[PDB]
């Protein structure tokens, strides 16, 4: 294992001296912002406190070096500078963490990347516009490829498309007044919206997304009310009962995305379970009793 460590520095050409720092970098301020509170006071990031303690102890060390203070003070100050840089990079790694007001451990730079709340899992592996969510409702009259969405949801989801069509059919003079029309819900948009969502598939999702059938594509149908109408046969794939659970709607924009929804993710093209090959969209509850 020692060779595993040493041969890296040998071959790579970088000196191990980098493990000892003479200067420490400071992250740009917008990544550690200080906001003003509605009570007149201020609230800053913990990284600012860590950098501030580092700066304070380093300047005090400079004072002690200039004054020729006894070696005990200078050494006991260098130790504190070491601990301050250690807290700035990974607070709590050695000993007890630097507590802020209320015995709360301050977040370090490395804490910006750790775990479920870190940068990777929270802002890179998962992030979206043109999306909504609402309670789901069974819709027996719907076809398997169809889903029912509220008009007020589709208006906001298809807002720019509806603005474009409002300015095309001369319902609005310019795109600006078209936006104002969509925001005020002028009675024309409801006749225009129907033309827009025509054969434009949408994506329905219900968490937890256990398998790939947890997200499926549907043809949207404008329905009154404020609930999403779901087909009774896809309830098995979503594991979705109707006791107050909501679903999310995502609108593919590009031609490639609409094609992937129309061909790869359409509910009618995914009747069988990819895990076992046996059907899922089949009579299950009331339907099997009726048959």
């Amino acid at each position: 294992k020692r060779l595993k460590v040493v041969a890296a520095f040998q071959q790579s050409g970088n000196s191990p001296m980098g493990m000892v720092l003479d200067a420490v970098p400071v992250i740009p301020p917008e990544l550690r912002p200080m906001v003003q509170l509605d009570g007149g006071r201020f609230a800053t990031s913990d990284l600012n406190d860590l950098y501030r303690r580092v700066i304070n102890r380093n300047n005090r060390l400079k004072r002690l070096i200039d004054l020729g203070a006894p070696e005990i003070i200078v050494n006991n100050e260098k130790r504190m500078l070491q601990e301050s840089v250690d807290a700035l990079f990974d607070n709590g790694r050695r000993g007890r963490p630097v507590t802020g007001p209320g015995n709360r451990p301050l977040k370090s730079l490395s804490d910006l990347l750790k775990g479920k709340q870190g940068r990777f899992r929270q802002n890179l592996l998962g992030k979206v516009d043109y999306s909504g969510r609402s309670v789901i409702v069974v819709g027996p009259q719907l076809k398997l490829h169809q889903c029912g969405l509220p008009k007020l949801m589709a208006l906001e989801l298809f807002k720019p498309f509806v603005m474009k069509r409002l300015v095309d059919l001369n319902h609005a003079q310019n795109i600006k007044s078209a936006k104002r029309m969509v925001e005020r819900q002028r009675p024309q948009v409801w006749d225009v919206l129907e033309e827009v969502i025509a054969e434009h598939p949408v994506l329905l999702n219900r968490a937890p997304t256990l398998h790939r059938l947890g997200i499926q594509a549907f043809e949207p149908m404008l329905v009154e009310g404020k609930a999403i109408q779901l087909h009774p046969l896809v309830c098995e794939a979503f594991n979705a009962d109707f006791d107050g659970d909501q679903m999310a709607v995502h609108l593919p924009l590009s031609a490639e995305a609409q094609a992937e929804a129309r061909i790869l993710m359409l509910s009618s093209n995914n009747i069988l379970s990819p895990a076992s090959g046996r059907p899922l969209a089949m009579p299950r509850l009331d339907m099997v009793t009726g048959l």
Partner: protein, 88 residues
Amino acid sequence: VGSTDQSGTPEQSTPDEVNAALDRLLIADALAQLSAEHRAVIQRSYYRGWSTAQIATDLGIAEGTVKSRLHYAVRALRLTLQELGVTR
């Protein structure tokens, strides 16, 4: 008092550029229908923020020439925008 990492503090947000993008599109459309001179003057007074004498020095024209070109190009853009129904 407060720490952003600590819970209970609202995160900062920035509005969307929808209104700005729409205004920019309409201004570009209205700009296309201008003469090369008027367009090259308004793009040097408002997009580059130069002074009157600076534009007069760059384009090799008089001071009052830049003043008059700006004065007319503003009204021509207003004409186009009011013809397209842009709110005052």
